[PDB]
């Protein structure tokens, strides 16, 4: 009953910059749409901000030298466009720095690194200009990505391009839910175009500049079960599989939007009048690999109510995490399955973000996270089972490193397998972290 992996497997561990930097307004950083966000009563609990968070902008050294310590060959994380482009075409040259140092510790730790473009923190100055409902914002992008490209590139062996597409634009322009915050589905709709053209933007500049390093796109999916044989409930489910799976899975892989989605947003599409000639093109482009986030499943029931797609979540209290998340490995499994079907047909899957949120308690400088931990093995078993059928997962990412700012949910919850304290800043090791690191060590369990 043991689970072995391929050995050519990456085993990794992720970040987000916003989410564990700090160092907001130091380094000619200007501030990103997420220091605006965080200050509107009621966004994020507590009022909680990015300010400082685990001051990894600080502690970096340390930080990369606790992943080698902790047994780890590959670190994903993102680099904060602002402290690149603080304003209009300028370039801090301070904030290369950063990142080339950091490039620095991580290679002196024989770690592989993956850089991820974007991961939601848009500078505020073009949230000015219109954020991502504006066309012109994609240009902004393709300034910032091929900076990031020539000054390093050599060193880069994976290139993370957008991560979920999905949370920055239906949460951030539609739900109001993430930065900056707005209510507005047509806003929603062409940003979530106009982010999904620019994995296609540096995809082609990746290409131009004739880099080596894998390339691809990171999609947060959710796997989603009716909550009823009821047919209403049956059409609810294929309702929220194209919201957050299809809507931005079908353009990168076949060129198009769902037929029934774009049917169904009637008039917020206004007529599919944001794509232009070409966009499409250049959105389909797979790349090398799929990048996937998981976390849990959905299950759908029909209601007749005001929302955009009028679909109710039943909350399942059964096993969940502390965000009330249920866990559901067997779910992971049957995503992992029907995205091979669809979509990637054979190309290599990544999962470059999964783990869970709970409860922690410091006994004896020790983190006895045995939940976190019946999460990760769990959900590691699924991805066990999707290889060993034939799966083309060839890595895995824990996600949360460090505790960290977790967006709306502010400090309130923490992902990571290394407990922060944020009076002193310290980090210390969970069991489940050093679990991880025996596990890496047998190459699995
Ligand atoms: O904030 C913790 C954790 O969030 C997720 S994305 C998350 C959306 O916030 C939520 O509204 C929706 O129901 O589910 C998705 C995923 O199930 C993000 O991927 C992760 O990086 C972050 O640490």
């Known amino acids: 009953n043991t689970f072995i992996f391929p050995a050519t497997f990456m ?13 907001t307004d130091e380094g000619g950083r200007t501030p990103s749409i997420w220091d605006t966000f965080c200050q509107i009563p009621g966004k994020v609990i507590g009022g909680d901000c990015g300010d400082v968070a685990c001051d990894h902008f600080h502690h970096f050294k340390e930080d990369v030298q606790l992943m080698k310590q902790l047994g780890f060959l590959h670190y994903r994380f993102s680099v904060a466009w602002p402290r690149i482009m603080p304003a209009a075409g300028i370039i801090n040259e301070e904030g290369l720095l ?50 990031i490209m020539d000054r390093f590139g050599e060193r880069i062996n994976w290139w993370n391009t957008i991560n979920e597409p999905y949370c920055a634009s239906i949460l951030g322009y539609g739900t109001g839910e993430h930065a900056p915050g707005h209510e507005n589905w047509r806003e929603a709709f062409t940003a979530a175009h106009h982010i999904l053209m620019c994995h296609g933007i540096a995809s082609n500049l990746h290409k131009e500049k004739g880099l080596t ?22 059409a ?13 899975a079908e353009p990168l892989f076949n060129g198009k939007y ?58 399942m209290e059964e096993p969940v995490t502390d965000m009330g998340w249920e866990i559901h490995p067997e779910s992971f499994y049957k995503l992992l399955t029907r995205i091979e079907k669809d979509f990637s047909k054979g190309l290599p899957i990544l999962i470059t973000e999964n783990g869970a949120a709970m409860r922690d308690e410091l006994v004896n400088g020790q983190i006895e996270d045995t939940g976190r931990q019946r ?8 991805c066990h089972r999707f290889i060993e059928e034939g799966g083309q997962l060839k ?19 923490r992902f990571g397998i290394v407990h922060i304290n944020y009076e002193t800043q310290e980090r210390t090791p969970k069991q489940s972290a050093l679990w991880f690191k025996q596990m890496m060590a047998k190459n699995g369990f």
Not at 11 to 23: A, L, R, V
Not at 105 to 132: K, N, R, S
Not at 267 to 294: A, H, R, S
Not at 375 to 382: M, R, V
Request: charged share 20%.
């Open 98 to 147: 950063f990142y080339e140092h950091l490039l620095d510790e991580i290679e002196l730790a024989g770690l592989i690194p993956m850089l991820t473009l974007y991961h939601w923190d848009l500078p505020q100055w073009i949230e000015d200009e219109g954020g991502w409902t504006q066309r012109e914002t994609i240009q902004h992008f393709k300034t910032y990505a091929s900076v």
């Open 258 to 315: 769902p037929e029934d989605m774009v049917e169904w947003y009637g008039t917020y599409l206004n007529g599919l009048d944001f794509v232009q000639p070409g966009d499409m093109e250049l959105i389909q482009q797979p790349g090398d690999f799929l990048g996937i986030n998981y976390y849990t499943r959905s299950i759908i029931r029909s209601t007749n109510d005001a929302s955009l797609l009028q679909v109710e979540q039943v909350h």
């Open 236 to 248: 609810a489910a294929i309702r929220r599989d194209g919201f957050i799976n299809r809507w931005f």
């Open 375 to 382: 999460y990760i093995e769990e959900h590691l078993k699924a």
């Open 213 to 234: 390093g894998k390339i691809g796109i990171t999609l947060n999916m959710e796997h989603v079960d009716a909550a009823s044989e009821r047919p209403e409930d049956v």
């Open 395 to 413: 890595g895995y990412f824990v996600w949360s490193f460090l505790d960290n700012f977790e967006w709306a949910w502010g400090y309130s919850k």
């Open 11 to 23: 085993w990794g561990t992720s970040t987000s910059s916003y989410q564990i930097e700090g160092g």
